[PDB]
Design a protein around this ligand. Structure first.
Ligand code: ZN
Length: 84
């Protein structure tokens, strides 16, 4: 490795309705974490509390950066059954 670990699309991440946070599955055992606000500002990097690695989060800046345009809902997803 030389620059970052690997960039992954936000769609792959797991949205957290609890407090608007995205997480990514790590091979070390834990899962990365990144707040929605971070992506809205530019913080497209996730850090693991165990391995302490770095990962790039790809998303739509046009969607995240919504000044006077509130997006709309599109179906629902319930597949939270990832146990370690
Ligand atoms: Zn990790």
């Amino acid at each position: 490795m030389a620059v970052f670990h690997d960039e992954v699309e936000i769609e792959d991440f797991q949205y957290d309705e609890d407090s608007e946070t995205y997480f990514y599955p790590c091979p070390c055992g834990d899962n990365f974490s990144i707040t929605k606000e971070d992506l809205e500002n530019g913080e497209d990097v996730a850090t693991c509390p165990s391995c302490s690695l770095i990962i790039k989060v790809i998303y739509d800046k046009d969607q995240f950066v919504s000044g006077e345009t509130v997006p709309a809902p599109s179906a629902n997803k319930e597949l939270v059954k990832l146990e370690h």
